[PDB]
Amino acid sequence: DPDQLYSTLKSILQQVKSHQSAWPFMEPVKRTEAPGYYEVIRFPMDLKTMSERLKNRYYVSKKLFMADLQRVFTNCKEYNPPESEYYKCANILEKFFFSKIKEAGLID
Numbered sequence: 365d366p367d368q369l370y371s372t373l374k375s376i377l378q379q380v381k382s383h384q385s386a387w388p389f390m391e392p393v394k395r396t397e398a399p400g401y402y403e404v405i406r407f408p409m410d411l412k413t414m415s416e417r418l419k420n421r422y423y424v425s426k427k428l429f430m431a432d433l434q435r436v437f438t439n440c441k442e443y444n445p446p447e448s449e450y451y452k453c454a455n456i457l458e459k460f461f462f463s464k465i466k467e468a469g470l471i472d
């Protein structure tokens with residue numbers, strides 16, 4: 365039951381991470397890549413941090429997992445213009461994310 369949730373979330377997270385549009389979101393944004401990012405974005409989130417959180421048994425609920433992954437997308441859209449490649453990646457990966465949640469039957 366806890367380990368079923370873990371398995372499902374691990375599968376979903378791995379699939380999201382393998383996706384071609386995930387490349388902007390794999391690790392914390394580097395100051396070198398985005399100087400002043402960390403003055404703007406108060407709650408940074410990325411897929412590596414999520415992987416660690418998962419391994420650390422933080423995601424005891426679907427809600428917690430969804431909030432972290434959604435934050436990845438909302439940070440991107442707050443920071444970047446709509447026609448930037450980063451914003452485009454976010455919406456493509458978000459579509460994929462939601463298909464994977466639905467496919468899994470993942471529910472509260």
Ligand SMILES: CC(=O)Nc1ccc2c(C)cc(=O)n(C)c2c1
Pocket residue numbers: 387388389393394397398439440443444450
């Ligand atoms: C690996 C990589 O190029 N990551 C980057 C670099 C720059 C940005 C910038 C500039 C914005 C942003 O939202 N993300 C997610 C980035 C990710």
